[PDB]
Amino acid sequence: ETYSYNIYHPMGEIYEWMREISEKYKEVVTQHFLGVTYETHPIYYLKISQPSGNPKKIIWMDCGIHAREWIAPAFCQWFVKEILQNHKDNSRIRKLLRNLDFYVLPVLNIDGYIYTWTTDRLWRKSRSPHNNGTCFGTDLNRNFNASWCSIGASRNCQDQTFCGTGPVSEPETKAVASFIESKKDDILCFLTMHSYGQLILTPYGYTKNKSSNHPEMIQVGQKAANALKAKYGTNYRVGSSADILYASSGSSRDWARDIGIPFSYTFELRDSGTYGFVLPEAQIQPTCEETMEAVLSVLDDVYAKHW
Amino acid sequence: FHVPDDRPCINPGRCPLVPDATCTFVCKAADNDFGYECQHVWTFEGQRVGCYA
Ligand SMILES: *[C@@H]1O[C@H](CO)[C@@H](O)[C@H](O)[C@H]1NC(C)=O
Ligand SMILES: *[C@@H]1O[C@H](CO)[C@@H](O)[C@H](O)[C@H]1NC(C)=O
Ligand SMILES: *[C@@H]1O[C@H](CO)[C@@H](O)[C@H](O)[C@H]1NC(C)=O
Numbered sequence: 001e002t003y004s005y006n007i008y009h010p011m012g013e014i015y016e017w018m019r020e021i022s023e024k025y026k027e028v029v030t031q032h033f034l035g036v037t038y039e040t041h042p043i044y045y046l047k048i049s050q051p052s053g054n055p056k057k058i059i060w061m062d063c064g065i066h067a068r069e070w071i072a073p074a075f076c077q078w079f080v081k082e083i084l085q086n087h088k089d090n091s092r093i094r095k096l097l098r099n100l101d102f103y104v105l106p107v108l109n110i111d112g113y114i115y116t117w118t119t120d121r122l123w124r125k126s127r128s129p130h131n132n133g134t135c136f137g138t139d140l141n142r143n144f145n146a147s148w149c150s151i152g153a154s155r156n157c158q159d160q161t162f163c164g165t166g167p168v169s170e171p172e173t174k175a176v177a178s179f180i181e182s183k184k185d186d187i188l189c190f191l192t193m194h195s196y197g198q199l200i201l202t203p204y205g206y207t208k209n210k211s212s213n214h215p216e217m218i219q220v221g222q223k224a225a226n227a228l229k230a231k232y233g234t235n236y237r238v239g240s241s242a243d244i245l246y247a248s249s250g251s252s253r254d255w256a257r258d259i260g261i262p263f264s265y266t267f268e269l270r271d272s273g274t275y276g277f278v279l280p281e282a283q284i285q286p287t288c289e290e291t292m293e294a295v296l297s298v299l300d301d302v303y304a305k306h307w
Numbered sequence: 308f309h310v311p312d313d314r315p316c317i318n319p320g321r322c323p324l325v326p327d328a329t330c331t332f333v334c335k336a337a338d339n340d341f342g343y344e345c346q347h348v349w350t351f352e353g354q355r356v357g358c359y360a
């Protein structure tokens with residue numbers, strides 16, 4: 001292909017990329033329908049799996065739950081490309097694929113993401129109408145059934161953190177949650193990619209309580225942050241959302257930990273505020289390369305726990 | 308339809324990424340049952356900004 005991973009792509013190009021990458025790597029990748037957005041845009045994930053007789057555990061990664069965070073879908077595509085281009089020759093990727101399958105959701109909030117290209121670059125929420133169309137959008141990362149709407153979320157539909165009309169009320173959330181719920185016993189690690197702030201966040205947002213395996217989570221997280229910084233010197237902070245970012249509820253990260261997935265992280269990618277959400281394309285390649293180091297460090301650690 | 312006037316947000320809460328930003332309630336005419344559409348807009352130093360990551 002002549003598909004550049006060093007620029008931002010509108011949704012139509014991502015639909016075509018998923019279809020092309022799936023056929024070119026058909027021996028190890030399949031594309032699966034999860035559901036449709038409010039506006040009937042299809043939501044897919046890519047499953048990377050090297051066929052074998054071993055039972056597989058699952059790594060889940062999703063990007064673009066928040067529409068304006070363009071660096072996150074860029075990284076999901078970078079991740080996929082790196083795995084696929086190196087899954088035969090690279091001993092470390094070949095290792096991971098002997099026992100893990102990767103499920104990657106490149107853009108979850110497709111309606112909002114299209115909206116940021118067509119109309120409003122700083123849109124965050126979905127595009128579902130509320131109050132007879134007088135307001136639009138649910139914050140999909142406040143819509144999961146994890147202490148739903150208890151703190152750090154609004155019941156006001158005009159607010160950027162609107163939690164929705166009820167837990168798992170939006171079609172995007174339903175599609176993710178029902179699927180994840182059906183695989184939960186096999187999912188070892190849940191990664192949700194966001195921007196910006198250069199943080200690696202553990203549960204929880206809705207309490208300052210820590211999960212039962214919090215020491216293990218921040219050891220893995222800090223080693224990943226160290227591996228990331230080694231690349232270009234980018235500084236990341238590791239800790240629970242409530243401690244180092246702000247309180248929230250209904251996040252997919254907390255919901256995943258609550259249903260028993262042992263490693264659940266939110267990554268907040270570049271930068272620290274100079275450009276914010278509108279990260280220049282000149283920073284896509286270095287952001288993705290350093291983030292790749294972090295993610296493979298996590299996957300190495302998760303893997304070493306079992307094989 | 309009487310489109311509500313733009314005004315400061317009422318009890319807007321924090322803007323964690325830009326703590327001193329200003330929240331405005333902004334409505335525009337729209338083709339729906341009530342004739343308008345509203346949202347909260349955050350601005351700092353003359354530019355719209357995001358508050359949550
Ligand atoms: C939220 O989760 C609890 C289970 O812990 C469940 O009993 C309740 O029905 C759930 N609500 C939805 C809408 O899934
Ligand atoms: C925090 O943990 C304590 C037990 O250590 C528990 O009683 C409390 O309900 C927890 N808080 C939340 C919000 O889950
Ligand atoms: C607003 O929407 C509801 C549908 O949920 C409808 O019953 C109601 O009549 C609508 N109001 C107006 C003024 O159209």
Ligand SMILES: [Zn+2]
Pocket residue numbers: 065066069194195359360
């Ligand atoms: Zn986000």
